[PDB]
Amino acid sequence: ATPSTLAELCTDSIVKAALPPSEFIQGITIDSDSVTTEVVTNSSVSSEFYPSATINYCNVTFAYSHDGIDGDQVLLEIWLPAPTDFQNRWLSTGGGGYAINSGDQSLPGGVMYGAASGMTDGGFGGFSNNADTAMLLANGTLDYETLYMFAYKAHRELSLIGKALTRNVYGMSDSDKLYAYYQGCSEGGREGWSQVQRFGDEWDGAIIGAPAFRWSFQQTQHLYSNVVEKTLDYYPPPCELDKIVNETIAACDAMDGKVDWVVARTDLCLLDFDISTIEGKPYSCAASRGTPAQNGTVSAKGIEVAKTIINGLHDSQGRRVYFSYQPTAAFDDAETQYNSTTGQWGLDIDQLGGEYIALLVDKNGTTLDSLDGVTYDTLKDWMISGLQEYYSTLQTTWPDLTPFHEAGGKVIHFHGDADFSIPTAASIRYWESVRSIMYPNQDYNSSAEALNEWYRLYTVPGAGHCATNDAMPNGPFPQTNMAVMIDWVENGVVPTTLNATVLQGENEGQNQQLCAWPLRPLWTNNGTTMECVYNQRSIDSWHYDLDAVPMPVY
Numbered sequence: 196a197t198p199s200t201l202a203e204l205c206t207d208s209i210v211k212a213a214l215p216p217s218e219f220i221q222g223i224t225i226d227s228d229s230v231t232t233e234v235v236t237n238s239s240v241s242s243e244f245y246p247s248a249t250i251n252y253c254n255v256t257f258a259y260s261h262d263g264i265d266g267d268q269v270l271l272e273i274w275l276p277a278p279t280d281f282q283n284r285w286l287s288t289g290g291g292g293y294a295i296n297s298g299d300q301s302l303p304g305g306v307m308y309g310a311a312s313g314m315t316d317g318g319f320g321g322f323s324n325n326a327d328t329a330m331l332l333a334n335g336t337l338d339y340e341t342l343y344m345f346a347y348k349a350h351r352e353l354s355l356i357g358k359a360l361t362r363n364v365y366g367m368s369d370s371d372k373l374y375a376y377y378q379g380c381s382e383g384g385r386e387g388w389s390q391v392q393r394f395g396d397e398w399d400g401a402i403i404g405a406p407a408f409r410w411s412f413q414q415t416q417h418l419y420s421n422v423v424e425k426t427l428d429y430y431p432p433p434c435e436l437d438k439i440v441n442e443t444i445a446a447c448d449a450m451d452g453k454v455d456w457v458v459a460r461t462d463l464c465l466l467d468f469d470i471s472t473i474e475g476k477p478y479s480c481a482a483s484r485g486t487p488a489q490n491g492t493v494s495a496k497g498i499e500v501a502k503t504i505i506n507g508l509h510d511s512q513g514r515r516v517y518f519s520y521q522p523t524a525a526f527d528d529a530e531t532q533y534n535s536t537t538g539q540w541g542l543d544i545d546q547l548g549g550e551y552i553a554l555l556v557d558k559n560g561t562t563l564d565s566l567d568g569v570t571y572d573t574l575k576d577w578m579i580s581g582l583q584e585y586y587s588t589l590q591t592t593w594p595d596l597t598p599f600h601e602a603g604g605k606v607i608h609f610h611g612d613a614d615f616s617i618p619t620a621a622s623i624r625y626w627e628s629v630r631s632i633m634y635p636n637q638d639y640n641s642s643a644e645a646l647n648e649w650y651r652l653y654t655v656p657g658a659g660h661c662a663t664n665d666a667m668p669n670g671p672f673p674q675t676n677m678a679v680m681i682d683w684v685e686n687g688v689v690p691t692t693l694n695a696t697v698l699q700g701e702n703e704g705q706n707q708q709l710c711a712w713p714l715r716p717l718w719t720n721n722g723t724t725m726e727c728v729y730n731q732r733s734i735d736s737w738h739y740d741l742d743a744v745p746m747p748v749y
């Protein structure tokens with residue numbers, strides 16, 4: 196009875212008959228008549244997140260609605276492998292920025308491993324419409340449905356509906372195991388944690404890159420560089436900060452034991468390199484289309500701004516509120532803009548930081564027009580007030596993962612060492628929060644080993660924000676996480692190191708391994724053999740006491 200070819204599977208009749216019924220989730224009505232099906236043959240796909248492949252699938256869409264919400268409509272898109280290629284897998288995929296889906300970019304990474312692969316539009320009025328465009332009913336009035344669907348509810352619904360459709364359409368019996376996975380990065384990484392924190396058996400394995408969790412701290416810290424520039428009254432030309440990054444890479448490359456223009460030890464960099472040594476170094480950048488030529492020498496004021504940004508937000512009493520990007524991360528938040536009238540570089544308000552304040556604090560826009568009157572203490576107050584307001588929805592830092600752990604779930608979490616958008620230390624902090632909450636009566640090594648049985652964290656040498664870094668093109672990137680997670684969950688293969696691949700430059704295609712936290716990489720034998728070493732001084736450099744904040748910040 197069950198279809199045997201892609202052509203037999205990919206029809207409106209087959210998919211409509213496999214949908215779960217309306218009220219299978221009480222409050223959800225599924226619109227059977229909305230089903231679309233389309234065969235896609237010989238699609239060539241590629242990504243930094245999965246190996247290159249050619250895939251065939253059934254592209255399915257359909258709509259559902261929440262009972263009692265006038266005008267409500269949610270769209271799902273699910274790609275179904277051919278029946279001969281289906282391997283009893285489900286893959287949920289997620290978003291980026293204020294989007295809850297990644298269009299056609301994540302779904303291939305499931306289909307090529309024989310997974311039914313899904314995404315949602317979140318109820319936002321189409322896949323290409325995002326949560327920020329749907330967040331406000333009026334100026335001052337949040338759409339709470341949008342907030343909750345973006346926070347966690349849309350992904351819960353996608354998994355429940357998609358897993359049921361996948362079991363029905365392939366003729367799985369109730370005893371047949373469906374291995375269910377998530378794969379996403381950035382806002383997508385936050386979306387993975389949103390489900391792992393609440394729903395213990397939604398997924399068997401979650402693959403999470405550089406998550407935009409710890410919402411109130413992560414979004415507000417995007418304004419920190421802007422406020423440093425205002426407070427010290429100096430707007431560095433982008434080229435001056437780019438020179439500091441280039442000289443930090445030059446000074447810290449060899450601290451990992453391998454001379455490759457990759458800083459694998461941003462911890463040793465932060466501990467041992469003083470950027471004051473860069474004062475007086477010349478810089479020159481060519482004129483762009485929209486920016487003029489920059490040249491000069493690295494200034495004392497430029498170094499003071501850079502050191503202040505790297506040191507992280509501290510309040511008016513010198514108490515630490517948060518942490519910032521690692522050394523070698525680009526100074527994106529600090530980006531200034533050139534004024535032709537005045538001939539001077541000036542404030543350029545960070546878009547992501549401004550959007551958080553305008554959309555979710557002020558609830559009346561997506562852009563902040565001014566930082567007049569905004570101090571370090573204003574940023575602290577936003578981080579603390581937002582923690583209370585968004586704890587239950589966007590914060591996504593709940594550290595008690597007892598249900599997920601007890602269901603036997605696994606996590607692979609990764610983060611670029613040179614991430615300029617989300618501080619690398621943000622990921623270490625959450626793993627340590629989970630460790631201390633779930634294993635409270637054990638010493639560091641014993642609790643770390645217990646957590647490392649099921650939730651492993653890896654930093655990526657030289658990598659940017661969920662991507663390779665053109666400044667450090669010899670750096671590796673974990674392109675094979677779905678295969679590694681399948682091997683862990685389905686085959687018992689524990690990822691002692693995380694598999695990685697050099698994707699760019701003269702070493703393109705070469706293999707590398709990534710050390711699992713709290714070990715760090717160190718190369719021996721003239722850069723030829725990599726070890727994963729325990730170094731207390733380095734481990735301590737990743738740990739921060741947020742003594743400005745009375746509440747625990749997980």
Ligand SMILES: *[C@@H]1O[C@H](CO)[C@@H](O[C@@H]2O[C@H](CO)[C@@H](O[C@@H]3O[C@H](CO[C@H]4O[C@H](CO)[C@@H](O)[C@H](O)[C@@H]4O)[C@@H](O)[C@H](O[C@H]4O[C@H](CO)[C@@H](O)[C@H](O)[C@@H]4O[C@H]4O[C@H](CO)[C@@H](O)[C@H](O)[C@@H]4O)[C@@H]3O)[C@H](O)[C@H]2NC(C)=O)[C@H](O)[C@H]1NC(C)=O
Binds near residue numbers: 233255256270299
């Ligand atoms: C997986 O499968 C999904 C589902 O099929 C697929 O997503 C769909 O993609 C198609 C193509 O991009 C989308 O189709 C467009 O839909 C818009 C909106 O259509 C609806 O609403 C309109 C009114 O707004 C109704 O009239 C209509 O019946 C639908 O209700 C259409 O407006 C688009 O048509 C215009 O552009 C086309 C170019 O692609 C032209 O070929 C077409 O003739 C239309 O042009 C002009 O029409 C008018 C001229 O008088 C005028 O309004 C403008 O000048 C306009 O240019 C087009 O049909 C569809 O919405 C997607 N559906 C969903 C749910 O997302 C995925 O792409 C697929 N993925 C893969 C990888 O296979």
Ligand SMILES: *[C@@H]1O[C@H](CO)[C@@H](O[C@@H]2O[C@H](CO)[C@@H](O)[C@H](O)[C@H]2NC(C)=O)[C@H](O)[C@H]1NC(C)=O
Binds near residue numbers: 236237
């Ligand atoms: C999809 O790709 C497959 C594999 O390249 C194509 O099938 C091949 O077509 C050539 C030419 O007819 C045959 O000699 C081979 O025997 C086919 N290989 C297989 C494995 O069947 C197929 O034509 C392509 N389809 C489309 C729509 O482009």
Ligand SMILES: *[C@@H]1O[C@H](CO)[C@@H](O[C@@H]2O[C@H](CO)[C@@H](O)[C@H](O)[C@H]2NC(C)=O)[C@H](O)[C@H]1NC(C)=O
Binds near residue numbers: 334557558559
């Ligand atoms: C968007 O909302 C914010 C907060 O509701 C408004 O900010 C206030 O503006 C008035 C003067 O216009 C000040 O006296 C208040 O101190 C501000 N409050 C805060 C908390 O900043 C802002 O005007 C609103 N913008 C628009 C365009 O309506």
Ligand SMILES: *[C@@H]1O[C@H](CO)[C@@H](O[C@@H]2O[C@H](CO)[C@@H](O)[C@H](O)[C@H]2NC(C)=O)[C@H](O)[C@H]1NC(C)=O
Binds near residue numbers: 478479480666667
């Ligand atoms: C900082 O380093 C980067 C390289 O990592 C420099 O960018 C390269 O510079 C050359 C000459 O200008 C260009 O042809 C390349 O296209 C650039 N590479 C990349 C990846 O963009 C950059 O100019 C250096 N900046 C400073 C201020 O010295």
Ligand SMILES: *[C@@H]1O[C@H](CO)[C@@H](O[C@@H]2O[C@H](CO)[C@@H](O)[C@H](O)[C@H]2NC(C)=O)[C@H](O)[C@H]1NC(C)=O
Binds near residue numbers: 640727730
């Ligand atoms: C915690 O565990 C680590 C191992 O993961 C211990 O690190 C080792 O320490 C010994 C003795 O100093 C060294 O000979 C090894 O080379 C270290 N191993 C690695 C992989 O670097 C560490 O000492 C333990 N901490 C405590 C307090 O016992």
Ligand SMILES: *[C@@H]1O[C@H](CO)[C@@H](O)[C@H](O)[C@H]1NC(C)=O
Binds near residue numbers: 332333334559
């Ligand atoms: C909201 O306020 C903005 C800023 O003044 C105004 O441009 C806009 O029309 C108002 N309403 C909405 C919901 O857009």
Ligand SMILES: *[C@@H]1O[C@H](CO)[C@@H](O)[C@H](O)[C@H]1NC(C)=O
Binds near residue numbers: 534537
């Ligand atoms: C540049 O400065 C002049 C005043 O000196 C101002 O009128 C102009 O708007 C400024 N440009 C921008 C984009 O701020």
Ligand SMILES: CCOCCOCCOCCO
Binds near residue numbers: 678681682
């Ligand atoms: C095709 C390359 O295979 C490399 C090793 O893959 C490991 C197995 O993972 C599970 C995927 O089916």
Ligand SMILES: O=C(O)c1cc(O)c(O)c(O)c1
Binds near residue numbers: 290547
């Ligand atoms: O998805 C992203 O790229 C993204 C989302 C965020 O909310 C964010 O603060 C950020 O720095 C990156």
Ligand SMILES: [Ca+2]
Binds near residue numbers: 449450453454457
């Ligand atoms: Ca190196």
Ligand SMILES: [Cl-]
Binds near residue numbers: 373
């Ligand atoms: Cl199931």
Ligand SMILES: [Cl-]
Binds near residue numbers: 244379
């Ligand atoms: Cl991944």
Ligand code: NA
Binds near residue numbers: 205207
């Ligand atoms: Na069809």
Ligand SMILES: [Zn+2]
Binds near residue numbers: 233
């Ligand atoms: Zn098509």
Ligand SMILES: [Zn+2]
Binds near residue numbers: 366367368371
């Ligand atoms: Zn079966």
Ligand SMILES: [Zn+2]
Binds near residue numbers: 600
């Ligand atoms: Zn346990």
